[PDB]
Amino acid sequence: SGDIQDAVGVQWAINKGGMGGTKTNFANTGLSIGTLLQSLESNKAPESIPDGAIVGIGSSSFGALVTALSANTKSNLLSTPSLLTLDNQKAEILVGQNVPFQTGTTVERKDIGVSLKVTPHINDGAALRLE
Amino acid sequence: QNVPFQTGTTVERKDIGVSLKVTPHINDGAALRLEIEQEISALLPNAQQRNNTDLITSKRSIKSTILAENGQVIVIGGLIQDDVSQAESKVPLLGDIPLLGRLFRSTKDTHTKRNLMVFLRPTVVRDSAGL
Amino acid sequence: VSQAESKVPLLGDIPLLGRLFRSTKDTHTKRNLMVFLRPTVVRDSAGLAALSGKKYSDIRVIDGTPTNANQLFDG
Amino acid sequence: SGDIQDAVGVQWAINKGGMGGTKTNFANTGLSIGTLLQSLESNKAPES
């Protein structure tokens, strides 16, 4: 398995005069300019809620926030159960936990983990059948 | 141990620990038949959810039917589970440079092996001398 | 493969400063999966002994990798 | 059985001027720079 994100955004906070402020709020990647001007009041009392690799170039009102992240996860699983059996004999291997689950509260036990159930049928020679 | 488990509260008793249930079928000579139901349970204090005892009631549970020879150490079952996983998180321009790439990224690696064999050994005694 | 954008509709289009206005989010994802099977027919105890000896040596070598020297049994 | 983790991360907190602060928050391995600048206020009262 594998996946790769790539999140990157430039935000502009030119509050040059007037009621308003020509801020380019992009509520896409984590932080935003609206919560940044509320984060001014966070820097007053609480100083709360960061997200992402942030870079803030500002003259403290004339702002520009660049937010970026790049997750990159890989994974590689392998499993090899193996058992001996006769024909027409339901073998089984079960490895790993046994958990409850609600059917209401009227819970019930149920097995979780690697598992295998073979049933062969064996000719006198080649070409076995497996279920 | 012997533990309770909820079936609702309408709890019930249930056995936890190493266990073995054999049923043979014996020819006058070699090549005995065995109906094995072997298991190894456990009980888990670590990973507890918002619910009851996460009873590992099977950790191995091989319920097979084999046909063995009276002095032969044989193999009934197995599991070979290999794993390797790795996540990263970096600034997308600076982690790539293979001179300072350690100084920006954040890695998490996880390798995991579980090897497991279940062997069996039958010995036929019919006179009291061998017993 | 998935990719979302969010831009000012006039300024993100210009392929010189288009990075300085948009906001992108890309997501690539692969999952490869195979399930293989291997049957071996044994009908005499000789081949069963051979399989048992191979698996027992292959677990002895895992014992061969404190964590002091592990033990054989009455084979 | 056996397993081995390996977790390692470098975090940069260059707050050179301006509203903001060019901190590289990686919420991957335990602590982070955001909870470190809140840990300044922890070092004030709780130290948690």
Author numbering:
A (entry chain H): 337 to 440, 454 to 480
B (entry chain G): 433 to 440, 454 to 576
C (entry chain H): 529 to 593, 604 to 613
D (entry chain G): 337 to 384
Question: How is this structure described in the published paper?
Answer:
In Gram-negative bacteria, the type 2 secretion system (T2SS) is composed of a pseudopilus assembly platform in the inner membrane and a secretin complex in the outer membrane. Pseudomonas aeruginosa has at least two T2SSs, with the ancestral nanomachine having a secretin complex composed of XcpQ. The T2SS containing XcpQ is responsible for the secretion of at least 19 substrates, most of them hydrolases ranging from proteases to hemolytic lipases that are critical for pathogenesis. In the T2SS secretins, each subunit consists of four N domains followed by the highly conserved secretin domain (Pfam PF00263), followed by an S domain.
After analysis of 18,000+ particles, class averages revealed that XcpQ is a pentadecameric secretin complex with no other symmetries observed in the two-dimensional (2D) class averages. At 3.6-Å resolution, the secretin complex was found to have 15-fold symmetry throughout the membrane-embedded region and through most of the domains in the periplasm. At 3.6-Å resolution, individual α-helices and β-strands were resolved throughout the upper part of the secretin structure and within the N3 domain, and the majority of the protein could be visualized. There is a relatively unstructured linker or hinge between the N3 and N2 domains (corresponding to residues 239 to 246 in the mature form of XcpQ), where the resolution of the structure starts to decline. Less well resolved density was present for the N1 domains, and no density for the N0 domains could be observed. The failure to identify these N domains raises the prospect that this region of the secretin complex, proximal to XcpP in the inner membrane, is not arranged in a uniform 15-fold symmetry. The disposition of the S domain in the XcpQ complex structure is equivalent to that of the other pilotin-dependent secretins. Structural comparisons with the Klebsiella-type secretin complex revealed a striking structural homology despite the differences in their sequence characteristics. We propose that a pseudo-6-fold symmetry exists in the proximal region of the N domains. The flexibility with which the features pack in order to transition from 15-fold to pseudo-6-fold symmetry provides insight into the mechanism for substrate entry into the T2SS, with the substrate-XcpP interactions competing for the XcpQ-XcpP interactions in order to gain entry into the XcpQ chamber; success in this competition would see the substrate be secreted via pseudopilus movements.
